[PDB]
Paper text:
PARS1 catalyzes the covalent linkage of proline to tRNAPro. Unlike the other ARSs, PARS1 exists as a part of the bifunctional enzyme, glutamyl‐prolyl‐[name] synthetase 1 ([name]), which comprises glutamyl‐[name] synthetase 1 (EARS1), three repeats of WHEP domain, and PARS1 (Kwon et al, 2019). PARS1 is a homodimer formed by the PARS1 protomers A and B (Zhou et al, 2013).
The piperidine ring moiety of DWN compounds occupies a proline‐binding site and a ketone group (DWN11251, DWN11748, and DWN11761) or alkane group (DWN12088) connects the piperidine ring with the bicyclic ring, similar to HF (Son et al, 2013). The most striking difference between the structures was the loss of the electron density map of ATP in protomer B of the DWN12088‐bound structure. However, in protomer B complexed with DWN12088, there was no hydrogen bond due to the absence of an ATP molecule. In fact, the electron density of the bicyclic ring moiety of DWN12088 in protomer B of the complex structure was not well defined, and the R‐loop interacting with the bicyclic ring moiety was almost disordered, implying a potential loose binding of DWN12088 in PARS1 protomer B. On the other hand, when the first DWN12088 molecule binds to PARS1 protomer A, the second DWN12088 molecule could not bind tightly to protomer B due to allosteric effects. This negative cooperativity would make it difficult to inhibit the prolylation activity of PARS1 protomer B, broadening dose–response curve.
Numbering used by the authors:
A (entry chain A): 1016 to 1311, 1315 to 1463, 1474 to 1497, 1500 to 1512
B (entry chain B): 1015 to 1311, 1316 to 1462, 1474 to 1512
The structure:
Amino acid sequence: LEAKKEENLADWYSQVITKSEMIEYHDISGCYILRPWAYAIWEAIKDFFDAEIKKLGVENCYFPMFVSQSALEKEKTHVADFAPEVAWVTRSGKTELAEPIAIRPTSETVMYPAYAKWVQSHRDLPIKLNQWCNVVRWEFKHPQPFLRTREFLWQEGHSAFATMEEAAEEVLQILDLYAQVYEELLAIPVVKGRKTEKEKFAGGDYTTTIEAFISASGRAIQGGTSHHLGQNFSKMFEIVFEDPKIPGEKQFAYQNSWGLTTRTIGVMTMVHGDNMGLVLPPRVACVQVVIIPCGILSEEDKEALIAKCNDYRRRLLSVNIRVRADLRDNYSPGWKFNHWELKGVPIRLEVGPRDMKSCQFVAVRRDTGEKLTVAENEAETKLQAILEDIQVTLFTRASEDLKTHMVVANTMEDFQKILDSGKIVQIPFCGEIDCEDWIKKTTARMGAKSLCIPFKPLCELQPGAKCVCNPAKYYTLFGRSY
Amino acid sequence: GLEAKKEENLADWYSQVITKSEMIEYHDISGCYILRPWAYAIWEAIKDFFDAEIKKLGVENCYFPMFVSQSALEKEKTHVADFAPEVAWVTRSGKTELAEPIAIRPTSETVMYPAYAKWVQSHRDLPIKLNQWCNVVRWEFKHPQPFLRTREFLWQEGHSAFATMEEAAEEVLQILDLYAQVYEELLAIPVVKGRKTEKEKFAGGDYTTTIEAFISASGRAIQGGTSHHLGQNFSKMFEIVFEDPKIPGEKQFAYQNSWGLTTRTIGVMTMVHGDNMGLVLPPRVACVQVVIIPCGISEEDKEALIAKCNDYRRRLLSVNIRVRADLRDNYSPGWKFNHWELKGVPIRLEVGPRDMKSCQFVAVRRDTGEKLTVAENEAETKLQAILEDIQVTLFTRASEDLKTHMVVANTMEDFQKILDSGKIVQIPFCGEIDCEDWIKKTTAMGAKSLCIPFKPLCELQPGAKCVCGKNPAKYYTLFGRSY
Ligand SMILES: Nc1ncnc2c1ncn2[C@@H]1O[C@H](COP(=O)(O)OP(=O)(O)OP(=O)(O)O)[C@@H](O)[C@H]1O
Ligand SMILES: O[C@H]1CCCN[C@@H]1CCCn1cnc2c(Cl)c(Cl)ccc21
Ligand SMILES: O[C@H]1CCCN[C@@H]1CCCn1cnc2c(Cl)c(Cl)ccc21
Ligand SMILES: [Mg+2]
Ligand SMILES: [Mg+2]
Ligand SMILES: [Zn+2]
Ligand SMILES: [Zn+2]
């Protein structure tokens, strides 16, 4: 494949997603086809996350994709700048609808009137619901596959609680799971943090987040969000119960909402991706081991080359390794090597006739590319061991890049000095909005925006330190971002 | 506590139980309904099974855009003039009218087939077998019900493209037997397989296959699943061509199938097994198979009443039985008795205070009202035995309730008599379209062609004449009232 990754990041990414068979383009701009190689990743992420939130009592469901005209701005759910991102159905066939229907850009306007009818007492809480679904956002700044699409797949959770304490607990549990996804499955290191006033979801009380860093572009990307909504929506959609113990006080529910999208797949491509194609974290690669015969003129033993391949396959499916034998004879073995490497398969297993009656095979890992040979009997054992060092390696190496590329700055000239080195940086920060619109202006003369306030900043903020001016309220992570 | 009796008022009875079993909730937009977890659970079980089966025949899951361009939807003869009012069109983004109307997927052929054309550049690239679970909008043609006919629904869409007709035609009937499996092995609804007539099959295809279940209470059958052989109709329009390996420089157009199954299943299972005190759920699809409920309401030993339920719970989770202890205090056992019966849980497990010191408990079945009593120490043995026999009941009772209402008519003489007591009937039928618009007008709200059954109730013989009487009969056709 043509591109490097230092070079022109976009075109490299354009080619890796297309030539690894993950994405296909579509007539309608900003929409993309998820071919099975990519969709499988989403399924693995969804299978992990789904097991997780059922242990916390969340149940899956499905809500309509359509929201009323009346219902959508019946309440101050979103801010005025969100109106342009809403797609409207105007016509059915060619008979104009009496009233425009909107395609859900998020489900809050669709679920919360249901919560209000379901909740008529203390018994009815908590409500913890999840749905995996598609949402369209006519996203104004320009799209690229995965990172920012115009239709995309996500799960969105909405839970309603009677007491504050339970809500604030579920906000961080969900956030730790998101971090689990990025770090246990995708091998991406993340920073947990809270949004500022400029960047928090206006209709809530506070917004939690994880932030990943793409060194090649030098930008951070927010990989997931968990809101504590308090009762802003409770009192607006009138989700009230009366407790007979506390006679005669309207009790509003405490609500959270949380979401995680296919931008996850884009982040894993960008950070682990090389100039030989994709690189797949083993615990997410739909195929972890591809079996190939090579040898790297005779007749009857070529079906015995292929009968041993399907034995290799079956024996490790009994060890629950996901495996595909590539028994196509149409292609040179060398061609399949490039082919499955551009798709980033972690382990290639070569079995040749002169190595077969050696009672063995060679394995090549996609991480480093070195070759080893391990007992035919010792296959279950050793191949699964190799898949795990592949994962810890890709976590470690991407960890080393985030570790190197995140540093502390205390003044503005050297926050600017190190930010134009393509690194993200934590600064003492006021926290107020106008101080922040300014930082991003004075860093163009794109600009650096608030990524988050890390729960665990890199250094303690000392008493009386100021940001630019008012004194500094916390160390916040700043940087250029998607 | 439920209002309607099915016998009395079918529409209201159906509206009453789907809400009060907490399966669906209504919504501002007509024909749209929220699937609460109790319904979505049924759907997920179906999908965990169907996905397992069609993966063994090599289909792969994927996701295609929901928006279809004007050009592509009206590109070729995919649909007909009838089929373009049911399509929802997005025209504006915010207050900015879009240059070109975007249409919301009523099916995905027009999204996928441009993609097959680029993926297929030789016969090595075939077959292509893709499935997607997704939502579909059809702003359709009469007043709606939850499940049975909605305006957005969930389904799976299978699309396969082949080099030879033999392989394609093979997959159309493989798929259909899976649909029959879900309806029959999972849902305990017996079905009849069939082919559509020329009016009723998918116009853009060559022949389209179907399963039909029968709901007695209204007297109507329902189309429960769909498998089309498309021939080279679409390959020729969307130009899915490959080079022939033997004939230098000649295109072969691909052979295509498409098959689909919708959440309309859950509705028909509501209609079929639902009784007059609410739903009945076949156990291998019931998200919870056992409800444990304490009964009898001193504290120090009622704490041993609630701890004994939780050993059953743990004991039955070790047999991979899905079980719920409902140990809530804010509700009386009678209220739970009701609550879970309207949700159709197969086995209710009541424990009353001296049955703990008897080393007993009582088990109640959801179909019959049966009660047994079994020793504490039996965990594996008896509860699974009843969980599996409950399923055999729901199947047969609906099976012979199909053998009830599906009878032979060879003449009209009794066919209209044989149609309108809540009957479905096979007739000798011409095969041509207007004898059928006639049969349905001579019945009235008409008797429609449901399908042409594979494997009918009696063999036909030469020179038999249709109900039309003019032209002779090419096959026995399944007729009846139908949604
Ligand atoms: N257009 C999009 N394509 C893909 N993922 C998206 C898109 N918009 C948002 N996301 C993801 O959805 C998650 C929850 O959505 P959210 O409502 O927080 O979006 P947002 O804050 O408007 O996004 P952003 O700040 O990136 O513009 C985020 O963690 C983000 O990663
Ligand atoms: O962060 C997610 C997690 C999942 C639940 N919902 C919040 C909503 C974010 C709030 N939010 C973001 N973009 C929005 C648009 Cl475009 C509209 Cl119209 C309305 C609201 C919008
Ligand atoms: O059985 C499914 C499986 C997936 C492929 N398509 C067929 C039926 C399409 C045939 N088909 C049925 N209803 C349709 C409407 Cl409303 C429109 Cl607009 C267009 C086509 C329609
Ligand atoms: Mg946005
Ligand atoms: Mg944001
Ligand atoms: Zn400041
Ligand atoms: Zn006729």
